[PDB]
PDB file of C-alpha atoms and ligand atoms in Angstrom:
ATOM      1  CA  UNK A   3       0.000   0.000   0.000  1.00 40.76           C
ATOM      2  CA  UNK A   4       0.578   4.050  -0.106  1.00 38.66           C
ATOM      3  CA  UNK A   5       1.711   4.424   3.521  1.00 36.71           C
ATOM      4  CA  UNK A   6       1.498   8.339   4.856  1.00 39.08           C
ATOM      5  CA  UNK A   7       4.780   9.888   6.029  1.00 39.65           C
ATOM      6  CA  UNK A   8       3.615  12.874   8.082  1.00 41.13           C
ATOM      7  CA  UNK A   9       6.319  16.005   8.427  1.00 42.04           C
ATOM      8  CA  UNK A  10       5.621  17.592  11.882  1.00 42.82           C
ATOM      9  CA  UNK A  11       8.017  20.780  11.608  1.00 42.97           C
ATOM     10  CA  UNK A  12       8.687  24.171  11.294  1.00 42.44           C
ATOM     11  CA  UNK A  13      10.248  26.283   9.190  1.00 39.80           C
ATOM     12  CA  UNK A  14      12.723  23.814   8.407  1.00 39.04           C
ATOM     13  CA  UNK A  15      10.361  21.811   6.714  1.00 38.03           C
ATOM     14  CA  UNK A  16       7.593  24.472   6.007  1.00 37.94           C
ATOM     15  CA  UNK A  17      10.246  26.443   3.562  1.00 33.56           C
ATOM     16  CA  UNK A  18      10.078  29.967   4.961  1.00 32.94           C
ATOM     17  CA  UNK A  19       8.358  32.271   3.091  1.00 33.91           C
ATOM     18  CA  UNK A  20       7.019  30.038   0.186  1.00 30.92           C
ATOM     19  CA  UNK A  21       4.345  27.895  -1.588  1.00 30.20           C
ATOM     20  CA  UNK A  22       4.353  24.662   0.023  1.00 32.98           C
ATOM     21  CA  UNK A  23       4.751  23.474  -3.293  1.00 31.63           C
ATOM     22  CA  UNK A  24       8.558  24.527  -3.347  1.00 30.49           C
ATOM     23  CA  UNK A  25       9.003  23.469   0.147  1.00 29.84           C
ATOM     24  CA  UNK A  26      11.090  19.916  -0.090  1.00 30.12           C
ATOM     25  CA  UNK A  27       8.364  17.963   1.245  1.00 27.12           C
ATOM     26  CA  UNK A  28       6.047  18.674  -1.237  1.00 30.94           C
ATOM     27  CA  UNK A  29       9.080  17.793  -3.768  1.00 28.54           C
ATOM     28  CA  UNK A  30       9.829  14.484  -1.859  1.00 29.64           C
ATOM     29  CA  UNK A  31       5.801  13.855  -2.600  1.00 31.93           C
ATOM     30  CA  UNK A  32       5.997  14.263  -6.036  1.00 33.81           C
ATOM     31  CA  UNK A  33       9.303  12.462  -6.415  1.00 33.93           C
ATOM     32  CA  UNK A  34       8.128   9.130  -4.502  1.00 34.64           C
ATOM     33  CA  UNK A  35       4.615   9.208  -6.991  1.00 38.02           C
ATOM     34  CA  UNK A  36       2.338   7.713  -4.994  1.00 36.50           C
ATOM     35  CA  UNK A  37       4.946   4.989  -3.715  1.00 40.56           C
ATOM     36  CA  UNK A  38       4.577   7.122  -0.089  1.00 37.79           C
ATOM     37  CA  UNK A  39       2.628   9.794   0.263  1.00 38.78           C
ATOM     38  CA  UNK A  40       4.269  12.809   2.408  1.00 40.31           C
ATOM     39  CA  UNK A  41       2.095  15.101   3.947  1.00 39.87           C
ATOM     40  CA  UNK A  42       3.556  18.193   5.281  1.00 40.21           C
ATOM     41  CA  UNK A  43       2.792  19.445   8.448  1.00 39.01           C
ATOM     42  CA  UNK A  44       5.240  22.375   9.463  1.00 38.36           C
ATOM     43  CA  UNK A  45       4.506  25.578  10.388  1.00 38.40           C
ATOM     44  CA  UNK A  46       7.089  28.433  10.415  1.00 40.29           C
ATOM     45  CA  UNK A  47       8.611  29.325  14.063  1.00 39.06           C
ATOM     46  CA  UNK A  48       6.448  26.393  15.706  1.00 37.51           C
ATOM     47  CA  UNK A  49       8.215  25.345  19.155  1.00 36.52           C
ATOM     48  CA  UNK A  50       7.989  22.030  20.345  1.00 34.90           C
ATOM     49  CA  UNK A  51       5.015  22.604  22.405  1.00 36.29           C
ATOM     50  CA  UNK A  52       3.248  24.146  19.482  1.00 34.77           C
ATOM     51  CA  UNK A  53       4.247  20.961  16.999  1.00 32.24           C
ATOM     52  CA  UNK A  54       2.783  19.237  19.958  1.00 34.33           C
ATOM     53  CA  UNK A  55      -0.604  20.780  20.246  1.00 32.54           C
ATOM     54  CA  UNK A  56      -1.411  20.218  16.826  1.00 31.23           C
ATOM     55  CA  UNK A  57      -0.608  16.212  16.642  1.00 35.22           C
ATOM     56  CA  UNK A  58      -3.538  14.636  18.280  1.00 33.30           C
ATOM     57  CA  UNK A  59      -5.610  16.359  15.171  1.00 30.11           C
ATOM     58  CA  UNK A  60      -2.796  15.049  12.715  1.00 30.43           C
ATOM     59  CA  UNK A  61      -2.859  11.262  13.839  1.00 28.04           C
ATOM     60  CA  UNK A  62      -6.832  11.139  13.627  1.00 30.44           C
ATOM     61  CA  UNK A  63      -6.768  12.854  10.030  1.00 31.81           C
ATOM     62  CA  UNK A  64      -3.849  11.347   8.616  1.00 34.38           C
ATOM     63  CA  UNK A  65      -3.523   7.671  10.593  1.00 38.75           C
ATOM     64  CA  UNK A  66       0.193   8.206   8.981  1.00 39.59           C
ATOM     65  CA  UNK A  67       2.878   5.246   9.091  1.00 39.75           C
ATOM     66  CA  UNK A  68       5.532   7.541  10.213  1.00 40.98           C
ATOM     67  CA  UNK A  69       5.913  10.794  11.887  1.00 43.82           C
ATOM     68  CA  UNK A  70       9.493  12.636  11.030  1.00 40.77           C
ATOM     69  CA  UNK A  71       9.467  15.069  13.776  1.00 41.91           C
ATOM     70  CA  UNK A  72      11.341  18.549  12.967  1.00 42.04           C
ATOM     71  CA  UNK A  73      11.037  20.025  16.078  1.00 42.15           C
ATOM     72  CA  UNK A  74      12.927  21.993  19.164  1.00 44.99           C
ATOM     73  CA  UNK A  75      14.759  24.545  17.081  1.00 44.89           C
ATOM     74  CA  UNK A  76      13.060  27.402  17.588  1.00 46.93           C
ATOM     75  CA  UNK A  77      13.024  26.334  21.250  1.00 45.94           C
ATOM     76  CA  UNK A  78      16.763  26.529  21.089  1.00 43.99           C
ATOM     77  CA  UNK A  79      16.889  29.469  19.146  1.00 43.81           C
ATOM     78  CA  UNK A  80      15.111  31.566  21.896  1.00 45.19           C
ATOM     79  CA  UNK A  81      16.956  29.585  25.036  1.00 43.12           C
ATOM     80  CA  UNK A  82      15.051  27.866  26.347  1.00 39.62           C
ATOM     81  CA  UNK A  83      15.274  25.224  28.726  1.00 38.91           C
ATOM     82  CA  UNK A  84      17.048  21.996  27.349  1.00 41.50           C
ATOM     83  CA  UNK A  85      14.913  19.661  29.511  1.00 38.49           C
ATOM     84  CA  UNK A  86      11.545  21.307  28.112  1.00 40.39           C
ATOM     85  CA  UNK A  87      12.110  20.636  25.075  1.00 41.22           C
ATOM     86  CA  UNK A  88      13.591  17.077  25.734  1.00 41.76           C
ATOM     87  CA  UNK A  89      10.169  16.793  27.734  1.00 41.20           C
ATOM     88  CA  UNK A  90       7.986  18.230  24.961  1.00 43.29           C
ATOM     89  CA  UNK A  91       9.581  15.692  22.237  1.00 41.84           C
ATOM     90  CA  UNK A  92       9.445  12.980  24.817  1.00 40.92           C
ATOM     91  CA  UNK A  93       5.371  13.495  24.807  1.00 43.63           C
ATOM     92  CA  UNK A  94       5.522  13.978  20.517  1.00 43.48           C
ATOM     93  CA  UNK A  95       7.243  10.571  20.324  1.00 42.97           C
ATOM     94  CA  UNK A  96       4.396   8.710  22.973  1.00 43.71           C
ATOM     95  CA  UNK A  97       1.652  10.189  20.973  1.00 43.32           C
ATOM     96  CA  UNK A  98       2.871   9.161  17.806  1.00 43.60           C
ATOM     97  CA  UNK A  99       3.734   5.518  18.964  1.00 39.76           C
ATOM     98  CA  UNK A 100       0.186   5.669  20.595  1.00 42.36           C
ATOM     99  CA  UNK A 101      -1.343   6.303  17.492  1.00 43.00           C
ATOM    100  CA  UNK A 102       0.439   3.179  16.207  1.00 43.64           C
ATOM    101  CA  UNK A 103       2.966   5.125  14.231  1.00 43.88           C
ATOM    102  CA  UNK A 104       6.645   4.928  13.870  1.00 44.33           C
ATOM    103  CA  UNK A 105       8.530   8.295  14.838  1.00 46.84           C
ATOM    104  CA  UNK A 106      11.518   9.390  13.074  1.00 45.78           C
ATOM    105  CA  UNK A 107      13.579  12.015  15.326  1.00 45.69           C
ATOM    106  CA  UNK A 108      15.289  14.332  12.872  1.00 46.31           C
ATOM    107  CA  UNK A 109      18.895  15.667  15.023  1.00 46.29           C
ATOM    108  CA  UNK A 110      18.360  19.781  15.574  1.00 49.12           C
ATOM    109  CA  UNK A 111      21.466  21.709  16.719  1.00 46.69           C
ATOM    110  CA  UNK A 112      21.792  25.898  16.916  1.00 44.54           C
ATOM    111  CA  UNK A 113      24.385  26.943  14.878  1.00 43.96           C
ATOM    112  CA  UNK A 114      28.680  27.114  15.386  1.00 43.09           C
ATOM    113  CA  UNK A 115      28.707  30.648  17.333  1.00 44.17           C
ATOM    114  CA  UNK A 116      25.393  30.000  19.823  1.00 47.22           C
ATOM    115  CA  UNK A 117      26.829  29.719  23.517  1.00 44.83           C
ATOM    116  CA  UNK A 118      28.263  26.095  23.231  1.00 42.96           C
ATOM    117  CA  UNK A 119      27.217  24.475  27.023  1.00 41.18           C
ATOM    118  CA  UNK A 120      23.932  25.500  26.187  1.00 39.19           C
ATOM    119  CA  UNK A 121      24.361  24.056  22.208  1.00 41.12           C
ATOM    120  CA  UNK A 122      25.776  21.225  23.389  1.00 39.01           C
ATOM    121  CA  UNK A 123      23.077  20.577  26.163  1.00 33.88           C
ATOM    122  CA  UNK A 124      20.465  20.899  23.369  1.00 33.01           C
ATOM    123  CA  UNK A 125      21.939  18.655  20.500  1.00 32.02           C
ATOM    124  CA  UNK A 126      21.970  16.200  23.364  1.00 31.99           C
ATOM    125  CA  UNK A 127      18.576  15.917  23.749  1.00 33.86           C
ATOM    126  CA  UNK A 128      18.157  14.282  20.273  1.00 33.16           C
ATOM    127  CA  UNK A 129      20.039  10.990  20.463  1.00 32.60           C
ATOM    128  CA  UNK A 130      18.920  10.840  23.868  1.00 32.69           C
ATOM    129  CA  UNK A 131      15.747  10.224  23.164  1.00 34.34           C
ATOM    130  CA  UNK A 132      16.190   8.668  19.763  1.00 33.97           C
ATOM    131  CA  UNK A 133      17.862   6.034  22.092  1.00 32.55           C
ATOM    132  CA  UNK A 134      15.157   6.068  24.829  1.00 30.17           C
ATOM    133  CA  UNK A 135      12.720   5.292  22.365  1.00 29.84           C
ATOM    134  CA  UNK A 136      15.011   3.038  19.806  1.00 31.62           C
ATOM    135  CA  UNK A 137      13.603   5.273  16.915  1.00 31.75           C
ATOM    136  CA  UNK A 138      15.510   6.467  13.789  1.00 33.78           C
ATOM    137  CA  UNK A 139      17.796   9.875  14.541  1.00 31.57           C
ATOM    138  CA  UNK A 140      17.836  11.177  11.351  1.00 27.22           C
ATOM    139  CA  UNK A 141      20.336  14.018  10.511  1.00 31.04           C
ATOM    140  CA  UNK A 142      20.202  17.533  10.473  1.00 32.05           C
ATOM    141  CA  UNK A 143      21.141  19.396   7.030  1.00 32.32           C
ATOM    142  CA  UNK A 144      21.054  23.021   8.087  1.00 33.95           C
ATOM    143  CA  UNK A 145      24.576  24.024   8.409  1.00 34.06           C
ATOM    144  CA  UNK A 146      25.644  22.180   5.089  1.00 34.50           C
ATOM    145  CA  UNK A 147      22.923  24.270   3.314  1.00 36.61           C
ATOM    146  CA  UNK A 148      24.170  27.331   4.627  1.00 35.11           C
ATOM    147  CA  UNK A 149      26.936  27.062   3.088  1.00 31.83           C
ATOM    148  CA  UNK A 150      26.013  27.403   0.122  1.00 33.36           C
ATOM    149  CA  UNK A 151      24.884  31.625  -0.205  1.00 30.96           C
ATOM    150  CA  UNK A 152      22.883  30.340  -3.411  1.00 29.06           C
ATOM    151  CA  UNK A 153      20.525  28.143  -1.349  1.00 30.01           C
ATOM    152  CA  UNK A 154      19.569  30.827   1.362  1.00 30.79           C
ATOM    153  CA  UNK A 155      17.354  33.612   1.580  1.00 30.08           C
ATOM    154  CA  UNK A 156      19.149  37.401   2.142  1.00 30.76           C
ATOM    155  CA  UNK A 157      18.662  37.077   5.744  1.00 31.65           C
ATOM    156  CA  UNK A 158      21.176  33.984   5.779  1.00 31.22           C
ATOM    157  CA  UNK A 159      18.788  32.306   8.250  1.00 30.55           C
ATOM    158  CA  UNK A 160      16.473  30.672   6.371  1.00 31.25           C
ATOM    159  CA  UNK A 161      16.884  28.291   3.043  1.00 33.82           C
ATOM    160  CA  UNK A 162      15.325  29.503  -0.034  1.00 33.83           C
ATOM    161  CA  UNK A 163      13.230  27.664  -2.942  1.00 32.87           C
ATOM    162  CA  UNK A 164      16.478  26.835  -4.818  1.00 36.72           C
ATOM    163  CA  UNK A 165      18.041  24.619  -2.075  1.00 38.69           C
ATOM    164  CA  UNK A 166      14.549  22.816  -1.844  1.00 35.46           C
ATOM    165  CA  UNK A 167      15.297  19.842  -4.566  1.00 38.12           C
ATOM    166  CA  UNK A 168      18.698  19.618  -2.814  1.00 36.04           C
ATOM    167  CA  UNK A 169      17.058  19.003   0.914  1.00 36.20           C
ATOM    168  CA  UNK A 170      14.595  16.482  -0.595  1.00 36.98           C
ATOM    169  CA  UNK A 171      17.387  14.455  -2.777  1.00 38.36           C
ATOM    170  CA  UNK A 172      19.038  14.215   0.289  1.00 38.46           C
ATOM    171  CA  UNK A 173      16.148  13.425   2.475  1.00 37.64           C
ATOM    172  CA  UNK A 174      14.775  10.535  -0.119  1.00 38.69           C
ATOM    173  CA  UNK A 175      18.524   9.396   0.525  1.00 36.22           C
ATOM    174  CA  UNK A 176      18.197   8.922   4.102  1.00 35.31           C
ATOM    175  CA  UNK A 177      14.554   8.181   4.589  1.00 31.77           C
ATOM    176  CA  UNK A 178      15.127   5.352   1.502  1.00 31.34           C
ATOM    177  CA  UNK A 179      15.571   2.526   4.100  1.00 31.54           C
ATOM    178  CA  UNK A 180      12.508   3.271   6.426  1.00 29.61           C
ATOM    179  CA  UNK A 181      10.066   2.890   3.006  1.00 31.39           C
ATOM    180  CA  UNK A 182      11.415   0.560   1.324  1.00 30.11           C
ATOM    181  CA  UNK A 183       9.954   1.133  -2.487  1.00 30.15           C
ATOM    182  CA  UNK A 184      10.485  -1.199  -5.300  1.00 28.40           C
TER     183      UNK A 184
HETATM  184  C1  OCA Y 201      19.009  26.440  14.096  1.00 29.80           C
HETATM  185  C2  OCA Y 201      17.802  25.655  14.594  1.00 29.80           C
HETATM  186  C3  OCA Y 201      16.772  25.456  13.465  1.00 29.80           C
HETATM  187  C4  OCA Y 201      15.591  26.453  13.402  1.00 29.80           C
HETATM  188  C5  OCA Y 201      14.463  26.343  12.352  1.00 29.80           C
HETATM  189  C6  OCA Y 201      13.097  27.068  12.566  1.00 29.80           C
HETATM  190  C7  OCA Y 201      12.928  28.476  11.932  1.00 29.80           C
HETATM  191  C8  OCA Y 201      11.510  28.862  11.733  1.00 29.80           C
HETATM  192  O1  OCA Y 201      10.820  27.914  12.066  1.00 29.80           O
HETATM  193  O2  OCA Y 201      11.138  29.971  11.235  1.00 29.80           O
END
């Protein structure tokens, strides 16, 4: 069958500041043809908590096979605590396995320059609890992406539509082994 791979993001996974149509999820749809379907649910600057509050309605309308959850950074990225948002993600990850779904935990880390304990302390959470909950850690492509000035908006924050097919090669690459298509 055409299993559902729900996005639960932000940003990240929305594309900032463009049709959802450009954003890579929508691209990984429309490369996997009805294989998987992905459905995209990010929302730009979501926290944790906010990803969280709009699940439950996801799992009822979707019943997806997996959940890739793109969540924390904007947690991070206004400081707050590490254990929150290791507590919020903790509750994502129970709902989703409630709901008889598999999560996949993508890795989220604040950039080279953020105050380092406090990076460090936050990356951590990720394998933490992709180990707690022997789920898939998936990696993080942020910082290779911005490298590359042609793949980011003028504010050097956020990815632009041309980095988009790039993001969702290399996400088809990694997610590959968790569909399993002919
Ligand atoms: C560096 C951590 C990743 C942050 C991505 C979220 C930005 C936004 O959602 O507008």
């Amino acid at each position: 069958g055409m299993d559902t791979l729900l996005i639960l993001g932000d940003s990240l996974s929305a594309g900032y500041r463009m049709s959802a149509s450009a954003a890579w999820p929508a691209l990984l749809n429309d490369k996997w043809q009805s294989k998987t379907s992905v459905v995209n649910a990010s929302i730009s600057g979501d926290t944790s908590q906010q990803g969280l509050a709009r699940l439950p309605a996801l799992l009822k309308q979707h019943q997806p096979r997996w959940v890739l959850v793109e969540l924390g950074g904007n947690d991070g990225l206004r400081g707050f605590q590490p254990q929150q948002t290791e507590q919020t993600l903790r509750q994502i990850l129970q709902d989703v396995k409630a709901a008889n779904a598999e999560p996949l935990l993508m890795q989220i880390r604040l950039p080279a320059n953020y105050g380092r304990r406090y990076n460090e302390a936050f990356s951590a959470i990720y394998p933490k609890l992709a180990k707690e909950f022997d789920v898939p850690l998936l990696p993080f492509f942020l910082e290779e992406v911005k490298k590359k000035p042609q793949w980011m908006q003028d504010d050097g924050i956020h990815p632009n539509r041309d980095a988009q097919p790039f993001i969702a090669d290399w996400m088809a690459k990694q997610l590959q082994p968790l569909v399993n298509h002919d």
